[PDB]
Amino acid sequence: ALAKIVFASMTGNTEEIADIVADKLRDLGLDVDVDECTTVDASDFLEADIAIVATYTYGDGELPDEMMDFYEDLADLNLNGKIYGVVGSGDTFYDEFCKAVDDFDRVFVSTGAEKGSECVKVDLSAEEEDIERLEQFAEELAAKV
């Protein structure tokens, strides 16, 4: 099984998170590809069994600037028969805490993809609690095979 993870990160918190999920999925025996959102087409997800987005949230528009194209292209795919999950970094200072995660979640649902595990929202940098959640997120997605 192949999981594709696509991330946006300006200061590294979301990339670490993406890398944490990827390391775990690899240790569980999956093929995994990790890409920066600017370098890849959303349609590469058609080739994977699991599609994952890792995003931060930035301002009232929520989506990072660089993620916009990818979001719009994702929203045009049919991903019935794929499994998806969403993770993110934000800042609990905002009531719109990890909103871009909820945005990607509802776009995924539109595509026909089946949610594989609850989405994980991380407050700034990841610490131990974030790690057991992200670890569980990966265990649960591997289990749906």
Ligand SMILES: Cc1cc2nc3c(=O)[nH]c(=O)nc-3n(C[C@H](O)[C@H](O)[C@H](O)COP(=O)(O)O)c2cc1C
């Ligand atoms: C100008 C600005 C606006 C932000 N707005 C939000 C927000 O609305 N919601 C949220 O959860 N976090 C918000 N954040 C927090 C960032 O998403 C957080 O700093 C995150 O760790 C950045 O991810 P990165 O390190 O992968 O670039 C904002 C940060 C900045 C600098």
Ligand SMILES: [Ca+2]
């Ligand atoms: Ca790649």
Ligand SMILES: [Ca+2]
């Ligand atoms: Ca469209």
